[PDB]
Symmetry: none
Amino acid sequence: EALGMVETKGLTAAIEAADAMVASANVMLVGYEKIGSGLVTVIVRGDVGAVKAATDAGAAAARNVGEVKAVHVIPRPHTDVEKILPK
Amino acid sequence: QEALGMVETKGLTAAIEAADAMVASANVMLVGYEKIGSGLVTVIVRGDVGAVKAATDAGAAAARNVGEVKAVHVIPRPHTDVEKILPK
Amino acid sequence: EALGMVETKGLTAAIEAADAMVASANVMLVGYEKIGSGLVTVIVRGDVGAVKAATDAGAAAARNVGEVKAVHVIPRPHTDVEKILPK
Amino acid sequence: EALGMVETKGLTAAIEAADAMVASANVMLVGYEKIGSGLVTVIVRGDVGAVKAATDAGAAAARNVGEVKAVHVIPRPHTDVEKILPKGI
Amino acid sequence: QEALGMVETKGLTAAIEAADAMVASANVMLVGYEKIGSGLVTVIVRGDVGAVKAATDAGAAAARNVGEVKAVHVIPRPHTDVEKILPKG
Amino acid sequence: EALGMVETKGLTAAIEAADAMVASANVMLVGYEKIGSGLVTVIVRGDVGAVKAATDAGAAAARNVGEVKAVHVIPRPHTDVEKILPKG
């Protein structure tokens, strides 16, 4: 299934993105990934339509709270990338 | 679903002061702190919407005199149980 | 009991703050915390009077070594010391 | 075998680089490394031709998501893959 | 107790040079390096006050020719057990 | 034996420095050290001449990939290489 990502500088904006994503569409919250330097990536899974709507809503909600650094949807991930995603 | 409140600061002393100011009222529960690097610390609380709004306002007011406030936000009705919504 | 904090930019100023605090008053060193951006917090505990004298001395000594970002005393922490402090 | 690297500022661009690298050629994803300043390196291994094609595709895909800081191929690593790579991949 | 000497750099190469110059200049024991992130590294030495003052001065002078020195300090007489003021790791 | 260091901003630059350094038989790769702020140090050992040529080659290869932050050779390290180097 499709992968959706919203990356912020600041955790409060990432929490807000996570909540707005799960509220807006039928997506599963995979989790948060912290890479340091204040950067937090919120990851969601679901059908491509649901993931596109959820990432759009999560990015729009996060921008009202803090800094959004990246927003992206991978409609059909290659099976080899599940290895680098947070459990 | 009880409300979630966040006060995110640059500086730990500012975050501890925000935590202490927030828990100073009986109906506000401290969930914990989260560190993400770049000196950013988030203090997370839970309780009734009104109690969380008053707590985050008080937490940000206390933190700003010690360090910098980066974010202040209340989620009145978090989706799922707060545990799924919150980082590990 | 009271909590005292001296937060510096860099570790050297923080170690000097820790030593000046224990030299000046009857306080216990809880530890050092790191949060990134070179920020280090030295945390002490004891009676309010001792913590006020220690933090004042700690900040004064640290300023001669590096940058002091914050100095603060919480006379009566509103929850358990272990619960108000980060893990 | 050849080593391929795509280093981005931010994780989202790195995940996109990883996905595009494995989709574009017969390469194995070794993993990702974090070094601070928001820098994330995605590392692949395989035949030189496959690694060159994969890194080119990974960098092109990552640039549409975020900032690409470095793209590089080591065709024949001098010491064993595990030796020249840092411990936690 | 024994004196503590510290040289804090931004960059590990300057810290290694400080550590080598500190142990070469006087009868001091290298305690170790402390990394706090943000590229900051503190080199800590222990020994007699005179030896520590000479060693820290030499360590800072040598490190400045390699990279950035952020702090230089000597604690002549620690006011509690050295294990209590030194960070855990 | 001598110690050589090439410190870069960027891991790709550090891996390229490491590969260039070990491209000659009498240079041993000790390892990498990360300290945050994107700074990575590649450490080598061997005869002073081999280490000087290795660090010069490591810095030259790394600079075309990312930034070189430090390049240094210690011809005669005091104590053994392990007592002067950080734990990891």
